DNA sequence: TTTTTTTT
């Protein structure tokens, strides 16, 4: 056959890079041949794929091998796999076989990782076709894993000659001429499913990131393909980097299974479609188990702010560092992010522990910046404007793809996390009702379109509206000062109503603060804690499970009685007591106390009292 | 020559199936399987499979139940072999079933030429997402909720054919249920050609497919639920209904189709499961029958039941009574007397009415819960879509003698109208006039006039429902957010205690957890309603019904004083029957009628609060509260 | 179904 002496040279260099790499940071520069050690671990677990750092092979042999493979990855891949099999035979001959009946050949997936750079979706070019690259972006769509037919096998339906180890092209391929020279069967190739080996496969769609080419352009999208262990390796709707080769997808319909090339196809033309074949995938976007996940210094820092007793106030201060004032509102953020203990009673009734906050401020109150910080600083956080939004896009949508199927809405896109709702006032009343039922149920059911599916839809909602007429009439009542269905009002945990004040001192302070925010830009802000530090502490608190206390039971019952008397009930109901308990849970989580404290209930009582105004 | 079971341990074959297909290997496997069936026994020593065969013949069932653990207990080698290559050993074990059944029931082939093996308790389990190509071609135990079901249509179990060229007859090839035959050749003349199916020789098996979707809870949070299709074959066809959670065990098969090929531009195969044994994941028993019969007593059994209604919800004892009566219901007397008890649960928002409705949902053997805004009147009634051309039923229709939980009170309104007037759903969709008998109880709830209840103006004025709608309710309930420091304190104590008891921190502890908030255990209660409705059929007391007549006449007189209807009398009778049922009384007693009178008189009192409430109270103090 | 000017 074709010598491809360069190919076999690359094979040899690749096996020598896999076995004689002789590099290891463990025990300082002491060489372990980390690829030989990875082969040893491979024997321990008997996987298929081999993780290969691009930088390792780059330092290997001056990176000439890295360059060659990175360009002609497609051409070199069979040689690389053959060399990997040779290495396995050398050191892990057991793994050389799949490893009872006969064990077939084991396929090894060379999933290179840690590439030098990531090229953006628009950076993609035909020049890179077949070259190993890495692409970043969020996963807009995915596919159910399905068994691509890697190696095919067919029984000759005229002589029974069985074929095997037939690689398939994009279109389902079949043997052309019977291997049995005596036989002359050119069709009738009953696929031997048992003999043939199928690899797992999954289509995945991604879109351009916001700060990628935002300049006057719609975010470009790419169809990457997951194979082998990579399948399902990443969750949907998350920014991740995919390393692999650029694959050109010919139209199978043209293959037969502007114009296109022809005269091969034969008379038929052929139109292509570029795509990407991911080899390795990396995402970039218990209390004791969480601590284990943390680094030693990270655990120390955790303990450090745990020891701090002002920690509560400093955290509240850290919230929305750019935003000035409205400290109670920042406290509301913190508490909602912490959430509350969700529980289902013995009777089974589910009791939500989440907190759905609502904000009613005049324009320019920076509520927009408020939500921007919230979502940006919040995982599982979705931001949307009520004025421009569709119910299905917000909760869930039904689409037909070969065939009726479903598409997650904002609630799904952020279920079990923050749900920012900007311009809520402008939001459609019917859509508001859809959310109402969905959030109250903590569940979304797609009854329509024939299908009757249902999804968890559990999450927290940060409603953001403006008072009717762009201004809150203090003479009027919250219910009436803003257009919104009262029952949904009942299930909004909080209502931060933002008013204007002519306090000259406050005006001067805020003006100076803004002007500094522009002068010194980032230098102006200085929260007590870093956002990553804040998130680590927050998750640690999430790990906590507050427990109610006898004194707390009492304090709660008297405080609820006092609230009922205060309204004496347009805004005071059993829902208010439920929110009181949830706020107590959130405060304890901020206090990182497994038990509730009447002080915590006092804080929550003051919070709700202020919300009442 | 045949081989030993230990010899079978040495697979010594290219594949597990390759080993199984070995002739002597097949003989050994069959012998061992028959040995297991006849020999393997419960610890009691009785041949569990012997009794299973006995029943199989008796019931004429064509599917034989099999427990995987039992074979794992003995002959586990065959368990592993089957797991690796389910199809082959399934066929062999089915023949073993032939032999085992015939010896105990000679000539059973007449009753069923064949039998189907039904493995059970398959240890390994995977979710739809868990499924992997490694899993393919092997048995898998999976769970989910059926999304859509197709009608049971016949399929060609066995097929002969006829070459158009000569084609007198072609072999009776067995259809695989996943692909066509496509012989693409003729034995009579060596070549291709149109191979007309031989209608003379062909076996037909019932065929069906139902889509299965991952359970919501099973879905990882944020993760998108996935669904796979599972083909159901004869016997297994039409076991469960769409929207029902189910677990199945079948071979994870697959096949080629250029459709997906072009769709994904890659050589990928569609994957499907051929169900071998289905399982849906309440019914009382003799122990519970006799236990209910004892506890059925005059000792405030009605009161105890009410106390166990919505125990998570404080007070509302009248509401608890109404919902209990609805759960048990009343005996219908067709000719067309309704037996259902339609109850509306009007209340101030956030008054837990939705929560008690959900409680009933959990506490209801069959019920339908829908949202007036989030539920479609079409989805309540029916819809038509291509299957092809087919219709589907509606939620109201889905409610068959089962309480129809609903709230948030258009097309839905007229659908209820037709429903309340007659418990059936007429429809002429696609120019096909027909009716769908729902015959089910209804439960309603809403906010008066979309705002805090108003004592002024009657209850009807406090709502917007048409008076017909109001009357056709067996009863109506009103809840008001009145403020009382003592009641508020009691409610707060109850709520905080509920949160504490429900807190995760707080199995054997369940007995202390229930805290006797419910006098009867909830499970026993659920079985109680089921057993009572199934068996208890109250008999009205004509002698007492005379006093009922004069009482209704008095109520009519007072309505003229300031509006009763025969519907009120029928509601009183129905709820008296329900009272009898709650205490497992097949004979209605005067006390049932007294409670019915009080309840219905109260439901009449809810009308016209500021107008007449006091006058009605004075008039009926003896009729409703006097005794 | 969802989005969508446009008229009714
Ligand atoms: N009697 C009661 N006992 C316990 N909780 C109650 C009671 N009445 C009202 N509640 C509380 O009110 C809250 C809201 O009730 P909900 O079912 O939403 O009423 P609605 O259906 O009117 O919205 C519930 O969480 C429930 O705990
Ligand atoms: Mg409710
Ligand atoms: Zn051949
Ligand atoms: Zn012929």
């Amino acid at each position: 056959k074709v010598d491809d002496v360069t190919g076999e040279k690359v094979r040899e260099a690749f096996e020598q890079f896999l076995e004689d790499f002789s590099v290891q940071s463990t025990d300082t520069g002491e060489v372990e041949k980390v690829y030989r050690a990875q082969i040893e671990f491979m024997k321990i677990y008997d996987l298929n794929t081999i993780y290969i750092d691009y930088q390792h092979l780059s330092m290997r042999e001056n990176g000439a091998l890295a360059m060659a493979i990175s360009e002609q990855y497609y051409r070199f891949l069979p040689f690389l796999q053959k060399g990997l099999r040779r290495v396995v035979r050398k050191y892990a001959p057991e793994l050389l076989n799949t490893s009872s009946p006969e064990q077939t050949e084991r396929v090894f997936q060379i999933s290179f990782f840690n590439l030098p750079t990531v090229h953006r979706i628009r950076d993609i070019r035909s020049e890179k076709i077949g070259s190993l690259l890495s692409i970043s972006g969020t996963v807009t769509r995915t596919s159910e894993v399905r068994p691509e037919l890697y190696k095919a096998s067919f029984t000759c339906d005229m002589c029974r000659a069985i074929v095997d180890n037939v690689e398939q092209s994009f279109k389902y391929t079949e043997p052309t001429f019977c291997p049995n020279p005596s036989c002359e069967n050119r069709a009738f190739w009953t696929l031997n499913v048992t003999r043939s080996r199928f690899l797992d496969w999954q289509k995945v769609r991604i879109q351009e990131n916001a700060n990628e080419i935002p300049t006057g352009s719609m975010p470009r999208t790419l169809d990457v393909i997951l194979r082998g262990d990579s399948v399902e390796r990443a969750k949907p709707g998350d920014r991740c980097k995919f390393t692999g080769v650029e694959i050109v997808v010919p139209d199978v319909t043209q293959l037969g299974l502007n114009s296109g090339v022809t005269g091969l196809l034969g008379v038929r033309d052929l139109t292509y479609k570029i795509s990407f074949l991911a080899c390795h995938v990396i995402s970039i976007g218990d209390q004791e188990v969480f601590l284990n996940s943390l680094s030693s210094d990270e655990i120390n820092e955790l303990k450090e702010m745990v020891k701090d007793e002002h920690i509560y106030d400093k955290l509240v201060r850290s919230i929305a560092p750019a935003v000035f004032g409205h400290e109670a509102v920042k406290k509301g953020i913190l508490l909602q992010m912490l959430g509350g203990v969700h529980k289902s009673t013995v009777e089974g009734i589910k009791l939500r522990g989440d907190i759905n906050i609502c904000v009613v401020g005049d324009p320019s109150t920076s509520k927009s910046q408020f939500l921007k910080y919230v979502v940006g600083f919040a995982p599982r956080s979705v931001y949307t404007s009520g004025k421009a939004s569709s119910a299905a896009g917000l909760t869930a949508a039904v689409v037909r793809d070969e065939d009726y199927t479903i598409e997650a809405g904002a609630l799904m896109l952020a279920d079990n996390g923050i749900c920012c709702i900007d311009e809520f006032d402008k939001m459609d009343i019917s859509d508001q009702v859809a959310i109402h039922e969905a959030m109250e149920q903590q569940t979304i059911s797609i009854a329509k379109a024939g299908i009757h599916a249902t999804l968890n839809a559990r999450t927290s909602i940060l409603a953001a509206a403006n008072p009717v007429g762009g201004r809150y009439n203090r003479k009027l009542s919250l219910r009436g000062n803003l257009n919104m269905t009262a029952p949904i009002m009942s299930r909004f945990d909080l209502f931060f109503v933002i008013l204007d004040d002519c306090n000259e001192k406050i005006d001067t302070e805020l003006a100076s603060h803004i002007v500094d925010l522009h002068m010194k830009r980032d230098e102006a802000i200085e929260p007590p804690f870093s956002a990553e530090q804040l998130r680590r502490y927050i998750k640690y608190a999430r790990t906590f499970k507050p427990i109610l206390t006898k004194e707390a039971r009492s304090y709660l019952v008297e405080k609820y009685k006092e609230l009922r008397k205060d309204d004496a009930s347009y805004r005071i109901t059993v829902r208010q007591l439920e929110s009181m308990i949830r706020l107590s849970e959130a405060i304890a989580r901020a206090n990182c106390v497994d038990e509730i404290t009447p002080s915590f209930i006092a804080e929550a009582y003051d919070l709700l009292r202020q919300s009442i105004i | 020559e045949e081989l030993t079971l230990e010899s079978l341990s040495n697979v010594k074959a290219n594949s597990y199936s390759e080993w199984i297909t070995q002739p002597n290997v097949s003989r050994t496997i069959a012998r061992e399987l028959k040995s297991f069936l006849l020999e393997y026994t419960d610890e009691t020593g009785r041949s569990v499979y012997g009794a299973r065969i006995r029943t199989l013949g008796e019931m004429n069932s064509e599917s034989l139940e099999v427990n995987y653990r039992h074979l794992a207990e003995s002959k586990a080698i065959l368990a592993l072999f089957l797991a690796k290559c389910p199809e082959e050993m399934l066929k062999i074990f089915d023949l073993v079933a032939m032999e085992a059944t015939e010896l105990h029931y000679p000539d059973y082939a007449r009753i069923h030429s064949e039998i189907h093996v039904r493995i059970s308790d398959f240890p390994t389990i995977y979710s739809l997402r868990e499924l992997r190509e490694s899993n393919l071609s092997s048995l898998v135990r999976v769970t989910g909720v059926v999304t859509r079901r197709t009608g049971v249509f016949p399929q060609l179990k066995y097929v002969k054919f006829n070459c158009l060229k000569c084609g007198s007859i072609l072999g009776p090839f067995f259809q695989d249920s996943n692909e066509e035959i496509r012989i693409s050749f003729c034995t009579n003349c060596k070549s291709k050609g149109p191979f007309r199916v031989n209608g003379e020789k062909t076996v037909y098996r019932n065929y069906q497919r139902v889509t299965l979707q991952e359970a919501p809870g099973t879905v990882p949070p944020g993760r998108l639920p996935r669904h796979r299709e599972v083909i159901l074959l004869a016997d297994l066809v039409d076991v469960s209904k769409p929207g029902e959670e189910v677990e199945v065990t079948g071979i994870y098969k697959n096949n080629y189709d250029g459709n997906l090929n072009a769709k994904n531009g890659f050589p990928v195969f569609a994957t499907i499961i051929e169900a071998n044994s289905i399982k849906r994941r309440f019914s009382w028993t003799e122990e519970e029958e006799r236990e209910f019969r004892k506890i059925s007593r005059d000792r405030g059994i009605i009161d105890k039941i009410i106390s166990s209604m919505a125990p998570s919800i404080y007070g509302h004892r009248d509401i608890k009574t109404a919902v209990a009566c609805s759960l048990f219901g009343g005996v219908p007397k067709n000719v067309s007397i309704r037996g259902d008890i339609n109850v509306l649960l009007l209340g101030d928002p956030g008054t837990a009415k939705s929560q008690i409705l959900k409680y009933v949902e959990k506490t209801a053997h069959r019920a339908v819960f829908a949202t007036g805004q989030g539920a479609s009147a079409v989805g309540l009634t029916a819809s038509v879509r291509k299957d092809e051309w087919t219709l589907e039923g509606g939620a109201l229709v889905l409610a068959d003698k089962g309480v129809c939980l609903i709230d948030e009170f258009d097309q839905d309104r007229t659908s209820i109208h037709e429903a309340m007037e007659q418990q059936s759903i007429s429809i002429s969709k696609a120019g096909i006039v027909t009716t769908l008998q729902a015959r089910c109880s209804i439960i309603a709830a809403a906010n008066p006039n979309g705002g805090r209840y108003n004592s002024t103006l009657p209850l009807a004025q406090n709502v917007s429902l048409t008076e017909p709608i109001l009357s056709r309710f067996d009863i109506l309930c009103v809840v008001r957010d009145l403020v009382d420091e003592e009641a508020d304190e009691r409610l707060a104590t109850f709520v905080v205690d509920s949160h504490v008891r429900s807190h995760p921190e707080n199995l054997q502890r369940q007995r202390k957890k229930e805290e006797e908030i419910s006098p009867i255990p909830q499970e026993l209660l659920m079985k109680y309603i089921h057993y009572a409705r199934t068996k208890i059929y109250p008999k009205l007391h004509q002698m007492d019904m005379d006093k009922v007549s004069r009482v209704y006449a008095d109520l009519r007189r007072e309505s003229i004083s300031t509006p009763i209807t025969v519907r009120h009398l029928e509601s009183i009778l129905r709820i008296a029957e329900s009272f009898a049922k709650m205490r497992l009384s097949e004979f209605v007693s005067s006390y049932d009628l007294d409670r019915a009178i009080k309840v219905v008189v109260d439901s009449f009192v809810d009308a016209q609060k500021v107008s007449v409430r006091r006058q009605l109270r004075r008039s009926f103090a003896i009729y409703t509260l006097g005794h």
Side-chain angles (χ1 to χ4, degrees), chain A residues 102 142 149 198 232 441 448 546, chain B residues 13 132 226 267 358 374 503:
Chain A
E102 171 166 17
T142 60
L149 167 59
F198 301 71
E232 178 169 2
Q441 294 292 322
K448 283 70 173 174
Chain B
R132 280 284 157 287
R226 300 292 192 180
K358 273 212 167 148
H503 191 260

Side-chain angles (χ1 to χ4, degrees), chain B residues 25-31 33-86 88-295:
Chain B
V25 170
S26 190
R27 304 169 214 296
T28 306
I29 298 153
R31 151 163 62 74
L33 287 159
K34 185 171 73 173
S35 298
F36 160 91
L37 289 175
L38 307 168
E39 300 154 350
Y40 178 101
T41 55
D42 173 58
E43 51 77 22
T44 302
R46 64 185 66 258
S47 189
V48 70
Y49 285 92
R52 278 184 208 172
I53 290 167
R54 278 183 63 269
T55 308
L56 183 70
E58 292 163 354
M59 301 315 78
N60 305 147
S61 160
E62 193 169 1
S63 295
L64 180 40
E65 180 180 1
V66 179
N67 175 327
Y68 190 102
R69 305 155 59 265
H70 294 192
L71 195 149
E73 174 175 356
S74 69
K75 307 288 180 69
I77 180 168
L78 300 191
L80 277 296
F81 291 11
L82 163 76
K84 304 284 182 183
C85 56
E88 303 295 328
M89 293 177 71
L90 280 160
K91 176 95 79 174
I92 299 165
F93 194 34
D94 200 78
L95 299 175
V96 178
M98 295 299 102
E99 300 175 354
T101 51
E102 276 294 332
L103 67 91
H104 165 54
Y105 272 121
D107 294 332
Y108 184 75
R110 297 144 68 196
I111 287 150
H112 284 286
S113 66
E114 184 159 42
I115 294 293
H116 292 284
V117 181
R118 302 301 188 204
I119 303 300
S120 181
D121 302 331
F122 199 44
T124 194
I125 294 169
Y126 319 113
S127 182
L128 306 196
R129 282 184 179 292
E130 291 192 76
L131 303 179
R132 280 284 157 287
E133 65 85 22
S134 61
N135 310 111
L136 284 166
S137 303
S138 180
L139 177 62
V140 299
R141 186 174 174 186
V142 191
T143 308
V145 189
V146 288
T147 318
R148 285 183 307 87
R149 174 260 294 283
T150 196
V152 182
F153 322 128
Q155 176 179 56
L156 285 71
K157 188 195 201 212
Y158 286 81
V159 287
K160 283 206 201 185
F161 293 91
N162 324 302
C163 179
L164 193 70
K165 319 312 193 159
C166 51
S168 84
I169 292 172
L170 303 173
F173 298 168
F174 178 61
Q175 207 274 333
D176 53 41
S177 66
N178 190 10
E179 303 85 1
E180 296 299 329
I181 290 278
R182 59 147 301 283
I183 62 184
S184 297
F185 190 73
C186 165
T187 187
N188 284 318
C189 72
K190 305 285 179 178
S191 67
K192 65 96 172 179
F195 319 112
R196 314 196 100 163
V197 73
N198 190 2
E200 180 62 26
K201 299 294 291 184
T202 181
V203 184
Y204 281 89
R205 71 207 166 198
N206 292 297
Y207 183 81
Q208 194 180 13
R209 83 181 66 181
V210 188
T211 299
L212 188 52
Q213 177 81 235
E214 288 176 303
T218 301
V219 183
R223 198 74 179 283
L224 295 175
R226 300 292 192 180
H227 56 284
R228 270 75 168 179
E229 172 53 60
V230 184
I231 287 163
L232 294 176
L233 270 163
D235 197 295
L236 276 170
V237 294
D238 184 72
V239 165
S240 177
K241 278 70 66 176
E244 294 176 339
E245 181 280 351
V246 174
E247 184 193 61
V248 192
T249 43
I251 301 186
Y252 192 18
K253 292 190 287 182
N254 57 2
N255 60 4
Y256 162 85
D257 63 290
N259 296 80
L260 266 290
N261 193 239
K263 205 281 195 171
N264 316 128
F266 285 155
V268 69
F269 284 34
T271 72
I272 297 94
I273 301 88
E274 177 153 277
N276 163 259
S277 310
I278 188 166
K279 180 61 67 175
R280 175 223 45 65
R281 325 293 310 292
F282 178 108
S283 283
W284 80 81
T285 177
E286 286 148 45
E287 295 79 1
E288 306 186 77
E289 299 174 44
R290 309 183 317 280
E291 191 281 335
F292 296 149
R293 183 61 272 174
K294 274 79 72 175
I295 62 172

Side-chain angles (χ1 to χ4, degrees), chain A residues 360-378:
Chain A
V360 181
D362 67 271
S364 178
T365 52
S366 66
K367 67 181 77 62
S368 60
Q369 316 310 108
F370 183 92
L371 292 164
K372 288 315 306 204
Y373 165 92
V374 170
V375 65
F377 172 62

Side-chain angles (χ1 to χ4, degrees), chain A residues 574-575 578, chain B residues 313-314 316 348-355 491:
Chain A
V574 193
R575 294 202 207 273
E578 297 175 354
Chain B
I313 281 162
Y314 182 105
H316 302 300
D348 213 10
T351 196
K353 58 190 169 267
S354 176
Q355 282 183 347
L491 268 295

